[PDB]
């Protein structure tokens, strides 16, 4: 399918001098990079995080990011010290690209101000977001005309360098991105939904890739009352899921929990509710 690579930046401007910045790089949902803010360097979280880019290339991308951080902070604190009332505030930047089915790339550069969409880089121009009015239009006017050279750099980063690096990363980490990790399932009893009523819980943890199918079933008829939880993260790149169901005490025998996952190579996981039926 489609695969993306993103660089996220989170800036918190507290007062006219202090301003913290965080940044990280993500291949889909896997963090591949961090940013050490003291040294201002890229932290390569995997052996293959270099992604077929030379040390001279990555060293210059570091220099670029350091200067971008310097200038961006400089200009925002310049405009913001004009009204100390705004402090504190937050700016979030999600940049990067996405390869579509067929190899067509599409680049993103989106900016949010205080958790609300501020502006975007659509096609080749800065488009302000509907919602933020004055600030979105002012930042767009400054970007579309004054801070030029920044626009051309954004275009070439998200449209040229980002897809090359993404494919370099995908090739460098082929054995980790294409990995398949089998889940472990187990049954348990949650809190009673009512007197006489019984709560069955099915846990499926430690599986990668993320897509998974979990259901409570009576043979082949899957129960429709089962409540699927959220697919939550584990450390070391696995996922967790919880499927619950409340049933009449007496109708619980015969029910089972079925788990389908790509790693199970066909033979699915089936766990029958036993309760206190086995001596």
């Amino acid at each position: 399918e489609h695969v993306s690579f993103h660089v996220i930046q989170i800036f918190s401007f507290v007062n006219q001098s202090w301003a913290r910045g965080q940044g990280s790089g993500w291949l889909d949902e896997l963090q591949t990079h961090g940013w050490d803010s003291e040294s201002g360097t890229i932290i390569f979280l995997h052996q293959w995080s270099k992604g077929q880019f030379s040390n001279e290339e990555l060293s210059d991308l570091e220099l670029l990011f350091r200067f971008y951080l310097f200038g961006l902070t400089r200009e925002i604190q310049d405009h913001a010290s004009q009204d100390y009332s705004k402090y504190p505030f937050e700016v979030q930047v999600k940049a990067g690209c996405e390869l579509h089915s067929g190899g067509s790339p599409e680049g993103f550069f989106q900016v949010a101000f205080n958790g609300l969409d501020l502006l975007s880089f659509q096609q080749t121009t800065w488009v302000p977001s509907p919602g933020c009015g004055s600030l979105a239009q002012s930042v767009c006017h400054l970007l579309n005309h004054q801070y030029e050279g920044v626009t051309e750099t954004v275009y070439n980063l998200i449209r040229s360098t980002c897809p090359r690096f993404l494919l370099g990363l995908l090739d460098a980490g082929k054995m980790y991105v294409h990995r398949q990790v089998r889940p472990e399932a187990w049954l348990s009893s949650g809190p009673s939904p009512g007197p006489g009523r019984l709560q069955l819980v099915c846990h499926v943890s430690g599986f990668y890739p993320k897509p998974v199918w979990v259901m409570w079933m009576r043979g082949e008829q899957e129960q429709q009352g089962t409540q699927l939880g959220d697919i939550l993260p584990n450390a070391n790149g696995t996922w967790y899921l919880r499927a619950t169901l409340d049933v009449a005490d007496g109708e619980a025998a015969g029910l089972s929990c079925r788990v389908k996952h790509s790693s199970l190579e066909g033979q699915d996981i089936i766990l029958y509710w036993r309760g206190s039926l086995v001596p």
Partner: protein
């Protein structure tokens, strides 16, 4: 304008709560904004020192999410919880870890 989103706290173990075997306790704190949050893993009330967390990240709505996790050996005498404090919380919110 500014949006403020209350954090969503979910506590779950990596493996079944095999009472006596090593395991990992995970507190997933998602969907909050702004970014400044205070997350602590508590064993019987006191804060656990050896705790680790993912790098800060945000979803598509720009709301942040973190994964705090610690290695632990569960015992019948111990209770575990996750306590987060955010601007959208008057008093710190504590979610205890159910055996399940």
């Amino acid at each position: 304008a500014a949006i403020q989103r209350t954090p969503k706290i979910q506590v779950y173990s990596r493996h079944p709560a095999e009472n006596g075997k090593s395991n990992f306790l995970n507190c997933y704190v998602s969907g909050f904004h702004p970014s400044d949050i205070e997350v602590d893993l508590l064993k019987n009330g006191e804060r656990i020192e050896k705790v680790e967390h993912s790098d800060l990240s945000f979803s598509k709505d720009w709301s942040f999410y973190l994964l705090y996790y610690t290695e632990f050996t569960p015992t019948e005498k111990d209770e575990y919880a996750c306590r987060v404090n955010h601007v959208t919380l008057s008093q710190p919110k504590i979610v205890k870890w159910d055996r399940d």
